Design a protein around this ligand. Sequence first.
Ligand SMILES: CO[C@H]1O[C@H](CO)[C@@H](O)[C@H](O[C@H]2O[C@H](CO)[C@@H](O)[C@H](O)[C@@H]2O)[C@@H]1O
Ligand SMILES: CO[C@H]1O[C@H](CO)[C@@H](O)[C@H](O[C@H]2O[C@H](CO)[C@@H](O)[C@H](O)[C@@H]2O)[C@@H]1O
Ligand SMILES: *[C@@H]1O[C@H](CO)[C@@H](O)[C@H](O)[C@H]1NC(C)=O
Ligand SMILES: *[C@@H]1O[C@H](CO)[C@@H](O)[C@H](O)[C@H]1NC(C)=O
Ligand SMILES: [Ca+2]
Ligand SMILES: [Ca+2]
Ligand SMILES: [Mn+2]
Ligand SMILES: [Mn+2]
Lengths: 240, 240
Amino acid sequence: SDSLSFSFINFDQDERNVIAQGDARISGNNILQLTRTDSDGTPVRSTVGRILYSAQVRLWEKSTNRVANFQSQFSFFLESPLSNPADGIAFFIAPPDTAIPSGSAGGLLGLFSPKTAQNESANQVLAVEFDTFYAQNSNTWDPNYPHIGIDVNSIKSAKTVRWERREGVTLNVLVTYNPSTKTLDVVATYPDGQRYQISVVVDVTTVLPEWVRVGFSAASGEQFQTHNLESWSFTSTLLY
Amino acid sequence: DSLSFSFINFDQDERNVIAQGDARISGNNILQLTRTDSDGTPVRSTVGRILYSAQVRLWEKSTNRVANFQSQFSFFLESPLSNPADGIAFFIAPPDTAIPSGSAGGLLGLFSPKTAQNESANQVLAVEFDTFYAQNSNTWDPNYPHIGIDVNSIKSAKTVRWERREGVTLNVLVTYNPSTKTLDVVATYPDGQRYQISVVVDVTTVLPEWVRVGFSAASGEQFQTHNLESWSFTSTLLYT
Ligand SMILES: CO[C@H]1O[C@H](CO)[C@@H](O)[C@H](O[C@H]2O[C@H](CO)[C@@H](O)[C@H](O)[C@@H]2O)[C@@H]1O
Ligand SMILES: CO[C@H]1O[C@H](CO)[C@@H](O)[C@H](O[C@H]2O[C@H](CO)[C@@H](O)[C@H](O)[C@@H]2O)[C@@H]1O
Ligand SMILES: *[C@@H]1O[C@H](CO)[C@@H](O)[C@H](O)[C@H]1NC(C)=O
Ligand SMILES: *[C@@H]1O[C@H](CO)[C@@H](O)[C@H](O)[C@H]1NC(C)=O
Ligand SMILES: [Ca+2]
Ligand SMILES: [Ca+2]
Ligand SMILES: [Mn+2]
Ligand SMILES: [Mn+2]
């Protein structure tokens, strides 16, 4: 597999190329609802939901030293009745058999396990998070404000940019990886043009195995919010 | 909504290919569809096929959408025979398509003998590169080597005369334009010799909404290797 690209303008309830994990569901409105809701559609506590595209991505090839670029465009919105809505949605890359880690329903966003969430040598996850909950005595790894973060085998982001949550408002996001500069880029924009940028230098060949899957994860612990992905398009090309 | 992938060559640890029958990846990273012996010599009575694992949304009734697609591939054939058989085809079929019974020969791994010329029993769209045409056996063929477009029948809706070139790679582009409902084929040899064949066909009447795409080849009493060097594919669903 030298390249893979796909696009979801919206989500089909009869979608064939998605792996749904945990509470992830596609609504009759063609929205992917990651975290669980009750019978009235209200977000609930202690829920994790993830999707992965079924086709695997060859992110790099050790035997010829090729490394893939990639680009992921998506838009999402969050809804909650709470003052401190939690926990956040993330675009992430992980090994093809990745499953929801134990104890990940909360600040670990469905991506990490508590005893190893800050130990990079125990993880294989590259993620772009949209973190809404940052209480310093529980989400201790976080900056003390909502943020967009790039996670490199740790729930403690290698870099963050301050971010404003907007109840029910769609955020459009472009994540790009340039192999030649080993730069992972993140641009996020609200409908009014309000923008957020963040980037890090990361060598994916030391962070992830050669074959990966790509997708999204969201979680709520004691505090909750819905995490609604509306669209997603991805592209990756393996290059010398 | 859309999908694209490419194989510059074939990885022996591929994850997104469904192989059927005798298809395998060689040490040169070539997809060898039909069976070969231990010296790489073609053998009788063999079918091999591959399908990309991710399913293609070829059309959607409820939104009156039909997808375009393009398939770019290079293959070469080798045989010691003066009448080498039977051919390779790019094809599209329902997602659970399996090698039909009796299809190791002129049916190209695509059709079953009883139903091979009965469009009412088949769900196959294919572009075939047919090297064997003996009129008392492959009665459905024209009496010469040919490239043909097959619509639910081994009897091509249209063919163009073609020349087989031993061991030479043929470059093929197949495109489907849903606004003109035209499937066309441009095949080119390295010296520039070109072949053109096209058919007005409405995919919504020949194939289900969800399909898989790939290749098939076969040999019956006569034989040849059917070697796929590369394949790139893209498909986008558009309003019609
Ligand atoms: C109001 O709940 C906060 O305080 C509780 C007790 O001090 C914590 O248990 C709780 O943490 C859990 O929920 C948060 C928010 O969903 C989550 O980030 C964390 O991982 C725990 O699951 C929260 O801090
Ligand atoms: C030399 O074999 C030819 O004549 C034989 C006797 O009539 C046929 O059996 C034979 O047909 C089978 O092989 C061909 C070539 O591989 C294939 O096209 C056909 O489907 C049969 O499997 C061939 O015509
Ligand atoms: C980090 O994880 C590694 C194994 O992946 C382990 O050997 C090490 O003890 C861990 N370090 C800490 C501080 O937990
Ligand atoms: C053609 O196929 C259809 C559907 O399988 C079947 O009903 C019909 O009897 C066939 N006609 C023939 C055998 O010519
Ligand atoms: Ca957090
Ligand atoms: Ca034939
Ligand atoms: Mn964070
Ligand atoms: Mn033919």
